[PDB]
Amino acid sequence: LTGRLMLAVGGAVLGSLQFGYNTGVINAPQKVIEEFYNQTWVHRYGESILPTTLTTLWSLSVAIFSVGGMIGSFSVGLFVNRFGRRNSMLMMNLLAFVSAVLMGFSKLGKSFEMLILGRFIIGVYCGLTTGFVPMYVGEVSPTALRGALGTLHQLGIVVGILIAQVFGLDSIMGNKDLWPLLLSIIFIPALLQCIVLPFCPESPRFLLINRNEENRAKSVLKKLRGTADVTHDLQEMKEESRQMMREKKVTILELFRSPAYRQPILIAVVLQLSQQLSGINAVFYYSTSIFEKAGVQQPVYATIGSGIVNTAFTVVSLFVVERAGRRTLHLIGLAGMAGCAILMTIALALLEQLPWMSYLSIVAIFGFVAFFEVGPGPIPWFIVAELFSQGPRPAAIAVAGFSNWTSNFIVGMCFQYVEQLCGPYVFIIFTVLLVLFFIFTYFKVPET
Ligand SMILES: CCCCCCCCCO[C@@H]1O[C@H](CO)[C@@H](O)[C@H](O)[C@H]1O
Ligand SMILES: CCCCCCCCCO[C@@H]1O[C@H](CO)[C@@H](O)[C@H](O)[C@H]1O
Ligand SMILES: [Cl-]
User: Do residues 161 and 23 make contact, with C-beta atoms less than 8 angstroms apart?
Assistant: First the structure.
């Protein structure tokens, strides 16, 4: 709208791009980084790395990111209310630069420890970012536009996944020599945000409420909203303030202890479990590895195809979530992912008998990814926001986010263990989970 509003949102969702890039960058170059792990292991000890050790060490490098994300999401409120939304985003680029350097120089340092540490730290940054950007974009934008502009967060997530995937081709940075730059290149969005943010406005909601500077809030609203009559924005921020002061902010402990909040927080947690325990990130962490075992032509291209499908259905989901009930779209998603995970299993199990089953795995994953963005992707966050009023809602989101990261960790840390143990029957484990989550949602989850 305004122009200065574009700059503020644009500089904010760079971190959304960061969130997606760091999510799906470790997929395509698994084999070349695993080779480095082995090359390091023989350099230190003289023997080749054990295959199960390489599985654990590489799983940890993928998963330690989620351990960091749980901590950062948990620390969002600490930073956002003390330093502001804009200054916290600026400040936290320190985390991105520290992580780019640890991962960028891990090969020079011959240290998978550095890489794992960098993965942990860039995790903390992303858990903080996925709290910062929605708040800032939501508080900086007009009321009529704050809904549409909010979608740029998840748009930047999926676009950044796609960029990391494309950058993972052997033809560019996804190879033996340039994979440290592939992990390290996040400093370019980071440096770019450090330059833009000092020119972005602080949140008017933050200046008016958290710091009690009405006149500075008014001045920022004047720049964000070109017209001089910003009293409607001021009154709404005051009207939202009075409504937010009507309820006492429930703590996490109170949420679990109160029989009035024990059931709604159950629906919210299980719905976050249903998003990650669907195995969505088996795809975005390991699709290149699983496509290779599926005999796919060129796995990295099939991976990129999933990220293209992921972006297309994220864009498609934005126009469908407000045209159907949360309950229906979540079950449709869980059901589609269940069938695609079945097709994935029959293709994996009939590959030795039929070579063209490699193409069926590409179709299974494309639809597995497609059904996710329409249901299990966004909907767990819709119900939790509509299950709770302003009083308990912050604590409920914090608990939801901790359930998300925790089950993300489980998949990314354990998928390869149950892969070398179940073979072509790994995705039935996801079908069994999806089906349980399906009957749970059919019985326990109300429609909002
Ligand atoms: C480079 C590391 C990250 C730096 C982030 C902290 C910036 C500290 C200064 O903040 C600014 O102080 C002014 C004077 O009090 C306020 O007018 C303004 O609202 C506030 O934004
Ligand atoms: C302020 C926005 C609130 C609604 C957000 C809706 C979009 C949620 C998308 O889910 C994300 O999908 C990625 C793959 O696409 C996964 O890798 C990631 O683990 C998962 O969390
Ligand atoms: Cl701010």
Answer: yes
Torsion of CA 335, 340, 346, 349, to 10 degrees: -120
Measured from the alpha carbon of residue 201, the closest ligand is 3
Residue 369 contacts residue 280 (beta carbons within 8 Å): yes
Beta carbons of 429 and 418 less than 8 angstroms apart: yes
Dist. CA 22–CA 420, nearest whole Å: 25
d(CA 55, CA 415): 10
Assess contact for 281 and 412: CB atoms under 8 A.
Answer: yes
Nearest CA to 349 out of 430, 433, 422, 431 is that of: 422
Looking from the CA of 273 toward its CB, the CA atoms found within 13 Å total: 14
Q: Is 175 helix (H, G, I), strand (E, B) or coil?
A: coil
How far is the C-alpha of 256 from the C-alpha of 266, rounded, in Å? 9
Ligand lying nearest the CA atom of residue 86: 3
Element (H, E) at 395: helix 393-422
Report the distance separating Cα 266 and Cα 384, nearest Å.
10
As given in the structure block, the two tokens for residue 402 are 């901790």
Q: What are the DSSP calls for 63-93, one per residue? A: HHHHHHHHHHHHTHHHHHHHT-HHHHHHHHH
Q: Is the CB of 19 under 6 A from ligand 2?
A: no
Helix/strand/coil for 271: helix
Residue nearest to atom 21 of ligand 1 (CA): 87
Rounded Cα gap, residues 36 and 426, in angstroms = 27
Q: Which token pair is 441?
A: 């949602």
Method of elucidation? X-ray
Locate 302 and state its tokens: 């099939």
From 146, 165, 274, 280, give the residue whose CB has the most ligand 2 atoms within 8 Å, as the site to mutate: 280
Going from the Cα of 154 to the center of ligand 2, the distance in angstroms, rounded, reads 6
Element (H, E) at 279: none
Q: Are 224 and 8 in contact (CB under 8 A)?
A: yes
